[PDB]
Amino acid sequence: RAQYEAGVRPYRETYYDPDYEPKDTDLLCAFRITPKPGVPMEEAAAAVAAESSTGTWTEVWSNLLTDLERYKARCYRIEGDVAYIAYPLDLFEEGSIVNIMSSIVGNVFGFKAVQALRLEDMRIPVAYLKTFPGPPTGIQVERDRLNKYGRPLLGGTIKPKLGLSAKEYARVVYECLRGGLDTTKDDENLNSQPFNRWRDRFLYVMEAVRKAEAETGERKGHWLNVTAGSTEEMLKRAEFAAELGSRYIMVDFLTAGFAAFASVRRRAEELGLMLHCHRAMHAVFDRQPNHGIHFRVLAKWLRMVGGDHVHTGTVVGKLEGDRAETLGIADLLREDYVPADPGRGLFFDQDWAGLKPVFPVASGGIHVWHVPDLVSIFGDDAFFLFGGGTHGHPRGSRAGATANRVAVEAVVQARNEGRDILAEGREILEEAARWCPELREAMELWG
Amino acid sequence: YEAGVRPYRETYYDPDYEPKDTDLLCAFRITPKPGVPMEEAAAAVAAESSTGTWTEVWSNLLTDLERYKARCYRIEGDVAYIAYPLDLFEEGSIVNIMSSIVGNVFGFKAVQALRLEDMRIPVAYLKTFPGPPTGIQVERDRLNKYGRPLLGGTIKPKLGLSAKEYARVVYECLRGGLDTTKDDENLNSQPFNRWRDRFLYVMEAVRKAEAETGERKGHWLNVTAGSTEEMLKRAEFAAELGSRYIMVDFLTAGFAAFASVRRRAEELGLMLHCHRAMHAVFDRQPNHGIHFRVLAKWLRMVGGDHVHTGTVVGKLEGDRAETLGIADLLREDYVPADPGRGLFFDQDWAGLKPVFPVASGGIHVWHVPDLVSIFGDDAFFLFGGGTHGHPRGSRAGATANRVAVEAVVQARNEGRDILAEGREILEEAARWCPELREAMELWG
Amino acid sequence: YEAGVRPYRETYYDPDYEPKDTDLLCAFRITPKPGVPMEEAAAAVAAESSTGTWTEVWSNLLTDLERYKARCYRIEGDVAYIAYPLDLFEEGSIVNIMSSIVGNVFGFKAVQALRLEDMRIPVAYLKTFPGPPTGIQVERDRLNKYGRPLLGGTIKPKLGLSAKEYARVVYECLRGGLDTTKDDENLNSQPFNRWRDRFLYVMEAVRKAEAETGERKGHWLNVTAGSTEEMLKRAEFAAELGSRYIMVDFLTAGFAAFASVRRRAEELGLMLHCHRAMHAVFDRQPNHGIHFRVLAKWLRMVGGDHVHTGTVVGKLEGDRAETLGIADLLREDYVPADPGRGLFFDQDWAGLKPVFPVASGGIHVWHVPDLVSIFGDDAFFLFGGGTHGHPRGSRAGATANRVAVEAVVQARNEGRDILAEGREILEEAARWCPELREAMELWG
Ligand SMILES: O=C(O)[C@@](O)(COP(=O)(O)O)[C@H](O)[C@H](O)COP(=O)(O)O
Numbered sequence A: 001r002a003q004y005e006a007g008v009r010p011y012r013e014t015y016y017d018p019d020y021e022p023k024d025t026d027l028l029c030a031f032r033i034t035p036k037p038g039v040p041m042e043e044a045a046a047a048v049a050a051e052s053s054t055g056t057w058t059e060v061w062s063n064l065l066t067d068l069e070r071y072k073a074r075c076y077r078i079e080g081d082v083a084y085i086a087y088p089l090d091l092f093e094e095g096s097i098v099n100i101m102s103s104i105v106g107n108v109f110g111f112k113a114v115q116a117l118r119l120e121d122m123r124i125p126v127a128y129l130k131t132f133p134g135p136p137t138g139i140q141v142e143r144d145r146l147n148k149y150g151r152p153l154l155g156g157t158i159k160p161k162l163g164l165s166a167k168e169y170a171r172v173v174y175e176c177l178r179g180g181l182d183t184t185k186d187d188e189n190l191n192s193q194p195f196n197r198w199r200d201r202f203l204y205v206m207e208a209v210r211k212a213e214a215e216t217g218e219r220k221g222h223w224l225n226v227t228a229g230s231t232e233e234m235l236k237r238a239e240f241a242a243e244l245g246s247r248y249i250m251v252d253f254l255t256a257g258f259a260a261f262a263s264v265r266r267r268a269e270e271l272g273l274m275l276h277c278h279r280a281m282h283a284v285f286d287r288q289p290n291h292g293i294h295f296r297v298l299a300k301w302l303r304m305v306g307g308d309h310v311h312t313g314t315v316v317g318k319l320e321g322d323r324a325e326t327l328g329i330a331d332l333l334r335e336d337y338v339p340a341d342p343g344r345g346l347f348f349d350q351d352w353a354g355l356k357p358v359f360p361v362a363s364g365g366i367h368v369w370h371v372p373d374l375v376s377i378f379g380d381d382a383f384f385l386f387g388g389g390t391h392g393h394p395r396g397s398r399a400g401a402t403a404n405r406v407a408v409e410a411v412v413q414a415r416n417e418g419r420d421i422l423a424e425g426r427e428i429l430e431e432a433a434r435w436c437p438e439l440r441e442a443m444e445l446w447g
Numbered sequence B, C: 001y002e003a004g005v006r007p008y009r010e011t012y013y014d015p016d017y018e019p020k021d022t023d024l025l026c027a028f029r030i031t032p033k034p035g036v037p038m039e040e041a042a043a044a045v046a047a048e049s050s051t052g053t054w055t056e057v058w059s060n061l062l063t064d065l066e067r068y069k070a071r072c073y074r075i076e077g078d079v080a081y082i083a084y085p086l087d088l089f090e091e092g093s094i095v096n097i098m099s100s101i102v103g104n105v106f107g108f109k110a111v112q113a114l115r116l117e118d119m120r121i122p123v124a125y126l127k128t129f130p131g132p133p134t135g136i137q138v139e140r141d142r143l144n145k146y147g148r149p150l151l152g153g154t155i156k157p158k159l160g161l162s163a164k165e166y167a168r169v170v171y172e173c174l175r176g177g178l179d180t181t182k183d184d185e186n187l188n189s190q191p192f193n194r195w196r197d198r199f200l201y202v203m204e205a206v207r208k209a210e211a212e213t214g215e216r217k218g219h220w221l222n223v224t225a226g227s228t229e230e231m232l233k234r235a236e237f238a239a240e241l242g243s244r245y246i247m248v249d250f251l252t253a254g255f256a257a258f259a260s261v262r263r264r265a266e267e268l269g270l271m272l273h274c275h276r277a278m279h280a281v282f283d284r285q286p287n288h289g290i291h292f293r294v295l296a297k298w299l300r301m302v303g304g305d306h307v308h309t310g311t312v313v314g315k316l317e318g319d320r321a322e323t324l325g326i327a328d329l330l331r332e333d334y335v336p337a338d339p340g341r342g343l344f345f346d347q348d349w350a351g352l353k354p355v356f357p358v359a360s361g362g363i364h365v366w367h368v369p370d371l372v373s374i375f376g377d378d379a380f381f382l383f384g385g386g387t388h389g390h391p392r393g394s395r396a397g398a399t400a401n402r403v404a405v406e407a408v409v410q411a412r413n414e415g416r417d418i419l420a421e422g423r424e425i426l427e428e429a430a431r432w433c434p435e436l437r438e439a440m441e442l443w444g
């Protein structure tokens, strides 16, 4: 019959500890808090750390059963608007993105105390980072498996988004691949529709894929969308895609969730499939700059659970983006050590513990005119996806795919002579179009 | 075929359209860019969540666009109505609904904000979903508890307790009056509390508490994990220990994994409580995200016996009128439209059995009268800190909450006005129950 | 590149290097051959357990060698410290550590004698290991025994006893007062006593003693076999017969088979006793082999609820100073360095649960006062010959050992100094326990 305080006390007297120094085995989270008026910054910040850790809204008698200072999180520093919170390594399950997200962003977002809250960044310790498998193949194995070096790998998204049948899907796929695009892909909403059933789409396009390979001499592919209602169907389509001879599968890793994505990733590696990830539904999180989760937290989670490719967004396309923000996200995927850059959105350093890099994928309303801006931001090791910029050509997919290939290859070659891309890209493209008719129509169409 | 970018307003906007009974209707509260009209923005969402793209493609002529394309048929100044043909969606997959409607259209340069308010699932599409395994009525029979809201509590602190101590806290709550308890949403498998020890320990407490009480008890074991196979392994372990219940975080785990776990859960004869963690990343702000009524619809479609609806008077933010609509949207067979409660569309549930709503948050005894007013008797009340925060331990806290609920319900059944007489009912009950007396004089 | 043979010192000896928190530090006791400097031998062992070889190869330039090479950073005259980076070792596998650290290095001509004294497991690498399935705390609840050492005993003779007679000795010892018994390390399945019969007969003896004594008994059935498939077949048969325990010779079976049996034991819910047979060939000599503190670290990581820590006062050798170090290396969450206790490095156990250290050998009642002093309340005292060697049988021998330990621990709990009053305490116990008298006056 032990006795305790049994009251209601502020969160900042047991969860705000400015003198704390974070360990190298601690999870560090940067939160962009907006408190309810009257409530102080340092009190709402302690609320976030309390309810992503052992805390609650009252003293409980169970607090004396176990030591609380060993496991409790604590907001160790506040820079006015950004509150830094340190989580012990003992609070998280080994090798599960679900728990690092069930706890950190579970209940802290819907509190009355905080009017709005954003998770700007997060430092994953090397101790926690090593319990994760990471990408199956990474960039370097990917390039060798495709036998393509020194060039941003191309790609298209077969349009119309929905409506095409399996026979008509495969003929468009063959047009893009024969045109010069290194790869195509299913659209994110095309799974098993009554007009484009998956068991027929998988069989049809791979005949188109294998036909284009025998005629061009290069190695092509097609990111079959294997997302489905459940993990069982997701694995069944992964199995069928492998035995058909495909090198690729695709998963909407956010709509399908992270547990299903991790389950598919293990099956995909066992079948020797390079797994492309689509970030659909990410814009619900990372759009508003005052609430949600920044993408670079999801970019860290993807590489942590394993994905050969992912969309980082295009800055100059038809979807929102920031150039400084994207550059940080690109190096969070492609590099091994990422020093903190305040001007590039990063708040912490990142030791990647030998985990292998991820291809950044630029997708959106990008045509030949975006190539000079696309090459500079991403460089050689990236994917350029021309969905509308290939089929939208005034002479079909094959003409559009060739023009896109010429534009990307001319600029990248031009970068080798030291020519300044951001000052001479227009003239470079005009010089290329002076001898490439397909690029001529594309340049005199979009502008 | 004429190449070139054309305004979206000419093809994917159609105000004179009358939606078929088999369409998938959606309501978007669009906030467009300056200089971009609502008509352009509304057609942008409908086109880009459907057959459309950012330009004109030669492959448009290959099939019939009008058969499949979405279209906006009504704009109420700020909210845009969009109709989706039934042939665009896979039969029984929440993921395709998510990856099509709420997948790509939110992150446009020309849409400063976009919130999916409500969407109407046609009966034809609804017939391909399994629905909740047990539902409200079968659950009440299985527990053998009728005519009152069921009580629960989150074992606290959230993390830190060992398996031995966790089962000791669980025993005190269940012995003290609570019908069920639950693992907290972040307690999956940690070094201080591994899952194979916690499952075996708290199930011993559940059986010990049940035998010494005479009532069926339960504990929502958290089978959430980092993979579908791991969760199915954890669900299987809980099943053969004799557990009635499991618990999955249906949003952080995902929807494909949630559907996989639901199918396995019904095979083992479990009752799958669902926790809505991370939902506030979506539904908090009023100008961006997805309203929880849409996420509440989807959960019932795929199947879940419980779901958190959000207590109105607790510590978590949540509206009162909108929560009433959600409670009707999860329990009732037919839900007519009600602009007061934010229900844009009329929803027919086509025989899908209902879902227990769960009210959890910073609630205590003082919130019992208001909670019973809102949720009636077919709901769960969770007192995480309102049980363990009692000045005399969990057994007293559980008794205080149990006495508070049973007293307020009895007065409501006797015809008293709960909203006006809650304080009087609670005082009259504390007049003969000390545990409730100490609970009230401590809080509020 | 320059091709040829080069001294090992030039590249793999870095006295200025500062070890990282993610490095794998080892302490090698080197005895160089007459005519080679100590650092050259220290550099040689570092290179031959890492990216190095005996000649400069053209393929070294293909990689950043300095990111992977192991280097010697401190020499203490005769002990060498080597720092192994984290990238060289596969996660979760003990076998890869021994393939690198204690592989080819022990056999080069330059280093005549080499012993691995201690090694530091970084927290980053340590986290990728499961640890003991149940540990100390959970097991005590599983047996419902607290506040005293747990008493067991090997069944003698080692080999020869038939299945029926073997279960008769087990019944006497358990009925007499022991908490567990155990199979002997070399009794897997022999023509005179097969495992199908031994497992079935023993589990009948355990249950009969468990029912008549009122407390929970057990028996560490040996599931060791020549293949992991056979071991798992025996592990499952022991599990469905109701046994609490299984026993594996974790050194003769091999670390891979041990990791496989440990994973299956946790799934089946079996406590896993580990026997260190063949460890002596490693750790007996003071100038060659592997110290048992390294094998104690390796065991706790890969898993195991018990390990034979060795008794100081017995027929088996073993120091006293190092024995306290190992017992702390198993049971404590953090183990600070102590050069007088043999520990070279600070060890952080990253939440891995502790392990019972088991003391066995040629011990009897006269050794109990010193045994309860070295270990304390958390250890197993195995009386193989001290239980059946009693003149009046094994039932009387079990009682004598049980009384001797429980009297000593109760005398410690009231302030008496055990090392000074062991004889007096044992005589006081013997003046009211006749069984203890005959054990005292036969082995005095
Ligand atoms: O759905 C689409 O619109 C695309 O197929 C582009 O088609 P177009 O190239 O014809 O526009 C891409 O998946 C989105 O841009 C994804 O954006 P993010 O990569 O930022 O997720």
Ligand SMILES: O=C(O)[C@@](O)(COP(=O)(O)O)[C@H](O)[C@H](O)COP(=O)(O)O
Pocket (backbone or CB within 6 Å): A056, A057, A107, A110, B154, B156, B184, B185, B276, B277, B308, B309, B310, B311, B316, B359, B360, B361, B362, B363, B382, B383, B384, B385, B386
């Ligand atoms: O984690 C918690 O805080 C709780 O256990 C409440 O325990 P207390 O009762 O001790 O606060 C609930 O799961 C969340 O509040 C969920 O809220 P929502 O239903 O809005 O997700």
Ligand SMILES: O=C(O)[C@@](O)(COP(=O)(O)O)[C@H](O)[C@H](O)COP(=O)(O)O
Pocket (backbone or CB within 6 Å): C154, C156, C184, C185, C275, C276, C277, C308, C309, C310, C311, C316, C359, C360, C361, C362, C363, C382, C383, C384, C385, C386
């Ligand atoms: O084989 C034996 O001798 C024992 O059964 C003891 O029997 P007695 O009690 O009759 O000696 C033990 O297994 C060893 O002593 C263990 O050696 P270590 O402690 O070195 O692992």
Ligand SMILES: [Mg+2]
Pocket (backbone or CB within 6 Å): A157, A187, A188
């Ligand atoms: Mg797309």
Ligand SMILES: [Mg+2]
Pocket (backbone or CB within 6 Å): B154, B184, B185
């Ligand atoms: Mg909770």
Ligand SMILES: [Mg+2]
Pocket (backbone or CB within 6 Å): C154, C184, C185
């Ligand atoms: Mg032996």
